[PDB]
Amino acid sequence: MNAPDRFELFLLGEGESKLKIDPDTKAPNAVVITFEKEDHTLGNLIRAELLNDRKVLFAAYKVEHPFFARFKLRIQTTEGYDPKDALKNACNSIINKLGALKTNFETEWNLQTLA
Amino acid sequence: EGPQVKIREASKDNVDFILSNVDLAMANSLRRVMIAEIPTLAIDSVEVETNTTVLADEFIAHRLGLIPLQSMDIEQLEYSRDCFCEDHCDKCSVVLTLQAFGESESTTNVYSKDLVIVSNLMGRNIGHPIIQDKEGNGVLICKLRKGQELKLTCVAKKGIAKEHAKWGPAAAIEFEYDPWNKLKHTDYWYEQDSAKEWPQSKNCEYEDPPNEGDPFDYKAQADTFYMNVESVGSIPVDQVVVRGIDTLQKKVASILLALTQM
Amino acid sequence: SNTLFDDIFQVSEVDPGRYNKVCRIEAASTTQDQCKLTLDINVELFPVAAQDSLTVTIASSLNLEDTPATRSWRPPQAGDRSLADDYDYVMYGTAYKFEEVSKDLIAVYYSFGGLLMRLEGNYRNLNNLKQENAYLLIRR
Amino acid sequence: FEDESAPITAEDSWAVISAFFREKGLVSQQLD
Amino acid sequence: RGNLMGKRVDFSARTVISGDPNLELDQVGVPKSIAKTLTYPEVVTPYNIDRLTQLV
Amino acid sequence: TLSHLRRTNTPIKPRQLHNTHWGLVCPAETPEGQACGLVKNL
Amino acid sequence: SLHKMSMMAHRVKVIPYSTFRLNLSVTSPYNADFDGDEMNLHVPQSEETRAELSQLCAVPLQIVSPQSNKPCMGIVQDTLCGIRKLTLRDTFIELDQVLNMLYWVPDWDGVIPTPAIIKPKPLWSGKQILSVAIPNGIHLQRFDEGTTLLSPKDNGMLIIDGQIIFGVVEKKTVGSSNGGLIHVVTREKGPQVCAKLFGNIQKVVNFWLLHNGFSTGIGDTIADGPTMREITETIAEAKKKVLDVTKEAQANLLTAKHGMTLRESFEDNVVRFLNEARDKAGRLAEVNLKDLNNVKQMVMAGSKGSFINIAQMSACVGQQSVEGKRIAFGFVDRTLPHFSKDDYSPESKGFVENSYLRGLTPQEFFFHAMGGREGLIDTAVKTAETGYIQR
Amino acid sequence: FDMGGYFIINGSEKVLIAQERSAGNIVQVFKKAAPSPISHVAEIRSALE
Amino acid sequence: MIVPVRCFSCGKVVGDKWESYLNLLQEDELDEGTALSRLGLKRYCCRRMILTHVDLIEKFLRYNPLEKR
Amino acid sequence: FIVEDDESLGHKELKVRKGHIAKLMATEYQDIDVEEYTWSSLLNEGLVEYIDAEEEESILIAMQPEDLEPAEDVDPAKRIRVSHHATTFTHCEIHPSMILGVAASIIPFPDHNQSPRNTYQSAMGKQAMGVFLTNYNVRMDTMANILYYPQKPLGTTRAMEYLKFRELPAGQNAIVAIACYSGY
Amino acid sequence: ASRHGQKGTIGITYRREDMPFTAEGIVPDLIINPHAIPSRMTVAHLIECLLSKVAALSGNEGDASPFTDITVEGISKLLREHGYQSRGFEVMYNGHTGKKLMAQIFFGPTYYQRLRHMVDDKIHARARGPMQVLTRQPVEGRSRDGG
RNA sequence: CCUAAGAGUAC
Ligand SMILES: [Mg+2]
Ligand SMILES: [Zn+2]
Ligand SMILES: [Zn+2]
């Protein structure tokens, strides 16, 4: 009855975007980015790669409710470093690592004879 | 350079490998994507023509939706939500038809080998139900007494495991790290001795056991994850892992694309 | 910024208690007979055995420069110079009691996030300690 | 087993129960 | 006692409850159907003509 | 269905599980409401 | 809805599922579980009713009950166990989990507290992170049994300026008790800040417990060999004392206590000896249980369970009583046809010497069934009578 | 698997619940309360089948 | 009613391993555990899926069909 | 079970022996060509007896034969039982688990539960959902609830195969974890 | 509800990837709160979970008759012979992050009944509807759209 | 539509 359609977990609703960034007034040079139709799968990955950065002072996500598939990621970088730049670098590093892993797994699987 | 992989066992329906020099978050994200985010073909709509069996119509529909279907070239298909057709066409679906009649005096078992693909696949490698047993008969869909008849048509769309578990191609995914508990991420529950009461995992042979005198390595992080991915049959398990990595990369690239375009 | 207090202590007893990572140690100063220390230490992160000599220093800050917490903690960048470089185990806490033990002996209580410390001694050298935040630095 | 007059075990008694439920049933009182 | 001291009232719903650690103490979760059934009369005012018109 | 077909009702401490009930009625099978103990199962 | 706190003004949050959803802390005034309970929702239809409902019956305004001049809502169930486990001196949190927990506090000021340990690895203790949820300016000082200004056992509670100086946070601090954190906060910063404290504590503690894990199983009800042996020895010693008292009574050498007959005095002594036997066995079992025991942890946190639960599950269920007395002789002079006439031994009158782990013998099972039947009947009679008396 | 033991009344399966009653032709003696003038009462629910 | 297609927990397809299981039980006189191990059901989720199934469909099929063609 | 003097062994013993058990087993196997041996044969040869509460007043019953019939290093895991220090038994319980009713016979390990929990499950397994009859497709009942995949319990009792529970189950074997996972 | 009076409603439903998982990829079909165990003292629930785990692994049927000589120690030894922790605990990994849970989780099969009380037959709301003919008050019952 | 009875849920 009240159970929502499953495709709402990954399909963007009408009139809303994947990302929305709002500056955070608690601390300087800090943003809060709302990711829509996402979950812990991307959240923990992005958070870890952001914390791998040296100029990221703070980076943490939260899924405010398991009902709705969206999460808020707070990112605060040092002075003179745009938080969107930190997000860009984290995403770039994740993509590079995933590509290297895919290449390595393909090469390793090509070495089998009992498959 | 980057994450390193060394595979132990290769099988048609299982791959057991090691995932070294990689962060814990990346390994868990790959596991989650394999569980949920791989598109796969499964029956989605059931038009029932005749059912004189003892099973309910939606019961048989539920059984049919769980039938694994070949999805090797599922990337060539399109989602039914973003296709220009009315309800279903050849570019976004596979139309099968299950027709069975109980002309035998004994019970006749309606398997999935009697599922006949109607829509012309246009040379793709999708639609065929996955057969695994040596007998050649697929999943036991229904049974028929003499004189019972079951005629129905199925439309199968591509889908991911998030919308419904019938689209899940990953089955169970064994995932372990630090078999010797060197990172001290667990506090082993015990009555007398934690070492005796907790059986050593099969992966403990792949790491050096602790010296029992060395101080705790607080700088150590998590890596070298032992992962065994099982394949339901829709796609070979190597393709399961590869497509999981591909879909995770696609998600991150979509984040980058939206960020740049806004 | 300067060392509010500094001494060398010898550990007389290590009490594991009901913990696996924290132990409570009693230490006697090797220079002043009237100074003694009770301190909770993360032994998992900093092993301590009985009859061990520990150089202990309580400071008001870690920067080498003089004072010009209220400022958010930032991870130490590579190449940062601070007093913690000279010590093995650094904790940060707040002083929550100044007790008059005797005519000359006073005791100061510090709570580093729940790890408790009580430093007792004659007021002639403990007077620098005051009710504020402090850093406890220990080297072996 | 081999001894016909040997004493029965705690496992044997269930056989007896089976015989009971072969003749009485679960609603024997209503029908009787 | 059955019609004056206590009487059946309108604008009331009843259903099973469930726990939610992600709700505030003063908040209650209302099913969308129940919210669509129970109604409140809002007096039309220059301060809320726009949103009331949108709801209409 | 089986429990209903083997149900006994007592018209109306009578609600207590008596010692004589051993093996003739179920020691623990009774409604929680006003029929607690009055309704028994063989 | 036995009292005014069982009818309170909430704020609507529309959700896409078929059940009402309410905070865990507010279930205590409602006496509401989630095992099929139904609840009612009334909507005011005018601004006057709406306003007086929000300004008089609001949930934050009902935190402190006039019933016992103490807060009626507190931290309960999983959050209480998680807050006990989080504030232990062993609990140290790495940088990433600290950042996640800090972000989970909605009113977090945005400054990362300096870690309790800076070298060789920046670690925040659980008390440091939990103190973020506690509003600034709150001073609390409770001294438990045997605590000093230093806390060797980490009991008691000292919070200075909104920071937990020391003490394990458990039922006595964040629970619905007078003088606790809830009462102090709602009497110092107002009901709204108290509700905010509820939310912040629940969020941070639930996140930590989710990423730490808590469970319970059959192994938590098992005591080691020596403790089981001592429990059996204690039961045997108590049964021997009961036998000696029975011999004294049967020889008429027993003297009747003033105010009761010989039989009443004998039954009183037997019941007292068996009760202290069960208590001693349960205390032995509880002392045996390690701090890693999950039932032990739940009892220590005060979230659920008690000493009697541990005693009945692990050591000995005890004496089954009907109408305040031992099992009566329903048959002629005997409880069951499996006991000889005039048998007053503990096993022949309803003493369950086997724990729930070990399992109950058929006679003990029947006697326990009789006890539970009495309990259920008493519950029904009590609720009916209390309803009439309340009206 | 259906066991019987129930009637079909107007198409509905009706089961007769076993009605408990005091046994007949048994002498039962009961003490009485202090206010009542009778202290003990012996009764038989005499009945012929 | 009839053997489920997929194990509830993990999702391994077990609807095709029912008649093989019955043949192993009957013709080979194998015990249940070894027969389960032979089919590849190594996790106890699938083992409980196949082991505890009750094949009610035979009972339903004993009755005559309502609509016989 | 009737217990007689049994002068040959010089001690109290059950009237039923392995021969009657073997004949009952043979009759059951034939049912699943020798002379039939039904419960009526046990009744008509003085092997078992019917006792009501009035007669149950004036008898002494042995709970289990293997431990109470024969006259007088133990497993610490086993529960504590007594031998009653008396040999004057007149009858023997066929099985203690026969004191439970139909709804309580479904409970696994009811002796390891607090009695109100057993009462709750007894009153709650009637509300359990399963297959009430195999011919539900030819019955026009007012309300019917049927499980898709009824499963016989992994933890099953010996007394639930006389209730046809393994043929018409009323539940499913779900992989349960006992954890404070999310607080939900 | 289990076969031990452990009644309860579904709080929330997580997908397979979010549930905690063992090292063998097994995720639970259900997660029940530990706090239901100590107060209710349903030790039989835990014993039956252990016995069901052993029976599923070994293929035999768990003999859960009340008054037999089946001990928890024997079931634990049988479980230990199968390569698992004797007391049924399993090292589980958090679904969201993959990190090991600091406390191991009691894990295993258990027999659960679905009861007749569904939420769809109990949800009921009424802003305005049919009124009683006599007292001009709302009618009684959710089947009549009552108040 | 009314009345009555019964079963059941949460206390
Ligand atoms: Mg309830
Ligand atoms: Zn199309
Ligand atoms: Zn499985």
How open is the CA angle B132-B134-B135, to the nearest 5 degrees? 105
The J residues from 22 to 81 touching G (CB cutoff 8 Å) are 56-63, 76-81
Tell me: do G200 and G80 sit in the same domain.
yes
| Strand L interface, protein residues by Cβ within 7 Å | F 9, 31-33, 35, 39; G 31, 33, 35-38, 380, 383; J 123-124, 126-127; K 7, 117, 132-133, 139, 144
Tokens 């001592």 -> residue: G230
Give the sign of the dihedral formed by CA K89, CA K90, CA K96, CA K99: positive
Ranges of H-type helices in chain I? 19-26, 32-38, 44-51, 57-62
Give the residues across from C29 on adjacent strands.
C9
What's the order of all strands across the beta sheet hosting K105-112?
K30-32, J172-178, K105-112, K89-90
DSSP C2-63: -EEEEEEEEEEEEE-TT-SS-EEEEEEESS-TT-EEEEEE-TTTS---SS-EEEEEEES-S-
* Cross-chain Cβ contact K122/E18 below 8 Å: no
d(CA G370, CA G349): 12
d(CA G293, CA G301): 12
d(CA G132, CA G118): 19
* Cross-chain Cβ contact K69/J78 below 8 Å: yes
Tell me: do B196 and B228 sit in the same domain.
yes
**Which residue in chain A has the smallest CA separation from G204?**
A62
d(CA G366, CA G355): 15
Tell me: do B161 and B44 sit in the same domain.
yes
Domain that holds residue G51: 1-62
Tell me: do G119 and G245 sit in the same domain.
no
Tell me: do B205 and B246 sit in the same domain.
yes
Comparing CA positions, the residue from G185, G206, G133 lying closest to residue G163 is: G133
H helices, E strands: number in chain H:
0, 5
d(CA A105, CA A108): 5
Interstrand relation of B40-51 and A70-77 (parallel, antiparallel or unpaired): unpaired
Tokens 């189950």 -> residue: J169
DSSP chain B: --SEEEEEEE-SSEEEEEEES--HHHHHHHHHHHHHS--EEEEEEEEEEEE-SSS-HHHHHHHHHTS-EEETTGGGS--GGG-SSSS--TTT-EEEEEEEE--SSSPEEE-STTEEE-S--TT-SEEEEP--STT------EEE-TT-EEEEEEEEEEE-TTT-GGG-----EEEE--TT-TT-------SS-HHHHSPPPGGGGGSPPP-SSSPP-TT-----EEEEEE--SSS-HHHHHHHHHHHHHHHHHHHHHHHHH-
Between B24-36 and A83-109, two packed helices, what is the crossing angle to 10 degrees?
70
Between G126-133 and G191-212, two packed helices, what is the crossing angle to 10 degrees?
150
Q: How far is the CA of G34 from the C1' of L11 (A)?
A: 13
Alpha carbons within 13 A on the beta-carbon side of B224: 13
Comparing CA positions, the residue from I67, B48, F3, B142 lying closest to residue J137 is: I67
Direct distance between the N- and C-terminal alpha carbons of chain H, in angstroms, rounded to an integer: 36
Tell me: do B54 and B16 sit in the same domain.
no
Tokens 């709002």 -> residue: A22
Distance J181 CA to ligand 1 centre (A): 22
DSSP chain K: -BTTS----------TTTS-EETTS---SEEE-TTHHHHHTBHHHHHHHHHHHHHHHH-S-EE--TTSS--HHHHHHHHHHTTS-TTSEE-EE-TTT-PBPSS-EEEEEEEEPPBS--GGGT-EEESS--B-TTT--B-SSGGGT--
* Cross-chain Cβ contact K137/E13 below 8 Å: no
- Distance from the K36 Cα atom to the nearest Cα atom in chain B, whole angstroms: 20
Q: Are G125 and G91 a contacting pair, CB within 8 Å?
A: yes
Tell me: do B53 and B154 sit in the same domain.
yes
Of the candidates B189, B218, B219, the beta carbon closest to that of G219 is on: B189
Classify the phi-psi angles of G288: left when phi > 0, otherwise alpha if psi is within -120 to 50, otherwise beta: alpha
Domain that holds residue I31: 1-66
Comparing CA positions, the residue from H40, H4, H43 lying closest to residue H22 is: H43
Chain B CB contacts of K93 under 8 Å are 28, 175
- How many domains, chain B? 2
* Token pair for G255: 């003297």
d(CA F36, CA F15): 6
d(CA J61, CA J90): 6
* Superfamily of domain A1-115 in the CATH hierarchy: RNA polymerase, RBP11-like subunit (3.30.1360.10)
Closest nucleotide relative to residue G33's CA, C1' based: L10
Tell me: do B159 and B50 sit in the same domain.
yes
Tell me: do G257 and G149 sit in the same domain.
no
> What H or E segment, with its residue span, contains residue G339?
none
User: What CATH number should be reported for the domain holding residue B170?
Assistant: 3.30.1360.10
Tokens 């000995």 -> residue: G316
d(CA A75, CA A61): 9
Calculate the dihedral angle through the C-alpha atoms of K35, K36, K41, K42, rounding to the nearest 10 degrees: -140
Q: Are G366 and F22 a contacting pair, CB within 8 Å?
A: yes
Ranges of H-type helices in H1-49? none
Interface test with B, best of C19, C23, C44 (most B CBs within 10 A): C44
User: What CATH number should be reported for the domain holding residue I60?
Assistant: 1.10.10.60
Name F23's Cβ contacts closer than 8 Å, sequence gap at least 6: J56, J93, J98, J99
Backbone angles phi, psi at G320, to 5 degrees: -85, 125
Comparing CA positions, the residue from G118, B195, G191, B169 lying closest to residue C89 is: G118
* Cross-chain Cβ contact K58/I33 below 8 Å: yes
Name B122's Cβ contacts closer than 8 Å, sequence gap at least 6: B90
Residue E25: DSSP 8-state: T
Interface test with J, best of G212, G361, G373 (most J CBs within 10 A): G361
Give per-residue burial for J159-172: e unless 16+ CB within 10 Å, then b. bbbbbebbbbbbbb
Tell me: do B47 and B111 sit in the same domain.
yes
**Which residue in chain A has the smallest CA separation from B254?**
A18
Domain that holds residue B123: 40-165
Ligand number with the minimum distance to the CA of G34: 1
Tell me: do B161 and B130 sit in the same domain.
yes
d(CA G56, CA I69): 72
Q: How far is the CA of A3 from the C1' of L1 (A)?
A: 36
Name G140's Cβ contacts closer than 8 Å, sequence gap at least 6: G157, G158, G159, G173, G180, G181, G184
Q: How many other C-beta atoms can be found within 10 angstroms of the C-beta atom of residue B10?
A: 18
d(CA J99, CA C74): 70
Q: Are F1 and J136 a contacting pair, CB within 8 Å?
A: no
Comparing CA positions, the residue from G221, K38, G365, G363 lying closest to residue J104 is: G365
User: What CATH number should be reported for the domain holding residue B109?
Assistant: 2.170.120.12
- Distance from the D21 Cα atom to the nearest Cα atom in chain F, whole angstroms: 14
Q: Are J122 and F26 a contacting pair, CB within 8 Å?
A: yes
User: What CATH number should be reported for the domain holding residue G82?
Assistant: 1.10.274.100
Chains linked to J by 3 or more Cβ pairs within 8 Å: B, D, E, F, G, H, I, K
Q: How far is the CA of G365 from the C1' of L5 (A)?
A: 37
**Which residue in chain K has the smallest CA separation from G310?**
K38
* Cross-chain Cβ contact E19/J183 below 8 Å: yes
Residues, chain A: 115
Backbone angles phi, psi at J66, to 5 degrees: -70, -15
d(CA H19, CA G314): 42
Comparing CA positions, the residue from B109, C83, G52 lying closest to residue I22 is: B109
Comparing CA positions, the residue from E27, G113, G26 lying closest to residue A64 is: E27
State how far the alpha carbon of J26 is from the alpha carbons of A97, D15, D18, J29, J67, in Å.
71, 11, 12, 5, 27
d(CA B171, CA J173): 19
Tell me: do G38 and G55 sit in the same domain.
yes
Interface test with F, best of G327, G339, G376 (most F CBs within 10 A): G376
Tell me: do G303 and G221 sit in the same domain.
yes
Please, what's the largest Cα pairwise distance for chain C?
48
Backbone angles phi, psi at C96, to 5 degrees: -125, 5
Residue C85: DSSP 8-state: G
d(CA G195, CA G184): 13
* Token pair for F3: 């429990």
Q: How far is the CA of K136 from the C1' of L2 (A)?
A: 16
Q: How many other C-beta atoms can be found within 10 angstroms of the C-beta atom of residue J153?
A: 29
Distance of CA J182 to the CA centre of its chain: 40
- What does this entry list as its resolution, in Å? 3.0
How open is the CA angle J21-J27-J30, to the nearest 5 degrees? 140
Q: Is B188 on the interface with C (CB under 8 A)?
A: no
d(CA J84, CA F31): 35
User: What CATH number should be reported for the domain holding residue G30?
Assistant: 2.40.40.20
Distance of CA F8 to the CA centre of its chain: 7
Cis peptide before G120 (omega within 30 of 0): yes
Tell me: do B78 and B151 sit in the same domain.
yes
* Token pair for A103: 């290449």
Give the residues across from G158 on adjacent strands.
G141, G166
* Token pair for G58: 């609001």
- How many domains, chain I? 1
State how far the alpha carbon of A28 is from the alpha carbons of B4, G87, G109, G137, J65, in Å.
39, 31, 12, 25, 83
Comparing CA positions, the residue from J180, E8, J92, J39 lying closest to residue G213 is: J180
Distance I45 CA to ligand 3 centre (A): 4
State how far the alpha carbon of G49 is from the alpha carbons of G13, G46, G389, in Å.
20, 5, 30
d(CA G123, CA C65): 25
DSSP G162-206: TEEEE----HHHHSS-TTSHHHHHHHHT-HHHHHHHHHHHHHHHH
Comparing CA positions, the residue from G306, G297, G348 lying closest to residue G326 is: G348
Chain E CB contacts of G80 under 8 Å are none
The B residues from 27 to 66 touching A (CB cutoff 8 Å) are 28-30, 32-33, 36-37
Comparing CA positions, the residue from J60, J53, J39 lying closest to residue F24 is: J53
Comparing CA positions, the residue from G153, G154, G351, G163 lying closest to residue G267 is: G351
State how far the alpha carbon of G30 is from the alpha carbons of G59, G168, G227, in Å.
11, 28, 41
Ordered domains of chain C (ranges, CATH): 1-140 (2.40.50.140)
Comparing CA positions, the residue from K87, K89, K84 lying closest to residue K76 is: K87
Kindly tell me the burial class for residue E42, based on how many C-beta atoms sit within 10 Å of its own C-beta (0-12, 13-18, 19 or more): exposed
